[PDB]
Amino acid sequence: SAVQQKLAALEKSSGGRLGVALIDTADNTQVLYRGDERFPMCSTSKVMAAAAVLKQSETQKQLLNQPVEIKPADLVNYNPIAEKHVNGTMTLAELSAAALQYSDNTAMNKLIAQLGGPGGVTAFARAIGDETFRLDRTASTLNTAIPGDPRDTTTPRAMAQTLRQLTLGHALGETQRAQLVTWLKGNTTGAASIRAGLPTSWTVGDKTGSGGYGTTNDIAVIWPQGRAPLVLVTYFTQPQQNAESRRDVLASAARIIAEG
Ligand code: NA
């Protein structure tokens, strides 16, 4: 397809490896580029962990208001929000918002612990039909993003389908889904990624991720005006362990998708 030639050209220009999955819910049509290849999720896995806690809250109605202690020993390699509450508490709602909107790794680790370990996050993915997602490590090491390493990976197709079920579908209770959508729309880390390649009148909710090998990811749900929503996954990784971030590639992929 024309979109696929333009994505392949973007990839060639970039020096790295690009994975894209678009779901157009107006007709459930899909555009894929390396859609079944594995990529390191990096912090985009925080969406699955937040959604898994939201699922628990369908039975434990007050779960999101539960306070969780933040201890000095809990603070890891990137804790912009949790550091503000050391020797205090944050609720699981506040930890979910910090994980999603600031990519706070201590917050993510509290979600993982609430779920009984990374296997509890993977379990939720399996329960909603995602057989590809796997979370293996906690937040300080899950984004090493080593080529060929299956840990902490998924494919663009699988993550696009899962994100659609979580935000537009009914994998979550209606109120939980609405909460996740609100959190994603309030993300603060995405301005240079998918959002930068889209018309300024489209509403976006997204979660970014970055890691070793210049891995630069973004997963988004997109609401154009007067048109059915879209789900877009853009994953990107590079050959050199020390490679720099390339959020521009994700913006460019989004732009190509939107023009198609
Ligand atoms: Na690495």
UniProtKB/TrEMBL annotation:
<keyword id="KW-0732">Signal</keyword>
<comment type="similarity">
    <text>Belongs to the class-A beta-lactamase family.</text>
</comment>
<keyword id="KW-0479">Metal-binding</keyword>
<dbReference type="InterPro" id="IPR012338">
    <property type="entry name" value="Beta-lactam/transpept-like"/>
</dbReference>
<dbReference type="GO" id="GO:0030655">
    <property type="term" value="P:beta-lactam antibiotic catabolic process"/>
</dbReference>
<keyword id="KW-0862">Zinc</keyword>
<keyword id="KW-0873">Pyrrolidone carboxylic acid</keyword>
<feature type="binding site">
    <location>
        <position position="143"/>
    </location>
    <ligand>
        <name>Zn(2+)</name>
    </ligand>
</feature>
<dbReference type="InterPro" id="IPR023650">
    <property type="entry name" value="Beta-lactam_class-A_AS"/>
</dbReference>
<dbReference type="InterPro" id="IPR045155">
    <property type="entry name" value="Beta-lactam_cat"/>
</dbReference>
<keyword id="KW-0614">Plasmid</keyword>
<dbReference type="Pfam" id="PF13354">
    <property type="entry name" value="Beta-lactamase2"/>
</dbReference>
<feature type="domain" description="Beta-lactamase class A catalytic">
    <location>
        <begin position="19"/>
        <end position="234"/>
    </location>
</feature>
<dbReference type="GO" id="GO:0008800">
    <property type="term" value="F:beta-lactamase activity"/>
</dbReference>
<dbReference type="GO" id="GO:0046677">
    <property type="term" value="P:response to antibiotic"/>
</dbReference>
<feature type="binding site">
    <location>
        <position position="139"/>
    </location>
    <ligand>
        <name>Zn(2+)</name>
    </ligand>
</feature>
<keyword id="KW-0046">Antibiotic resistance</keyword>
<protein>
    <recommendedName>
        <fullName>Beta-lactamase</fullName>
        <ecNumber>3.5.2.6</ecNumber>
    </recommendedName>
</protein>
<keyword id="KW-0378">Hydrolase</keyword>
<dbReference type="GO" id="GO:0046872">
    <property type="term" value="F:metal ion binding"/>
</dbReference>
<dbReference type="InterPro" id="IPR058131">
    <property type="entry name" value="Cefotaximase"/>
</dbReference>
<dbReference type="InterPro" id="IPR000871">
    <property type="entry name" value="Beta-lactam_class-A"/>
</dbReference>
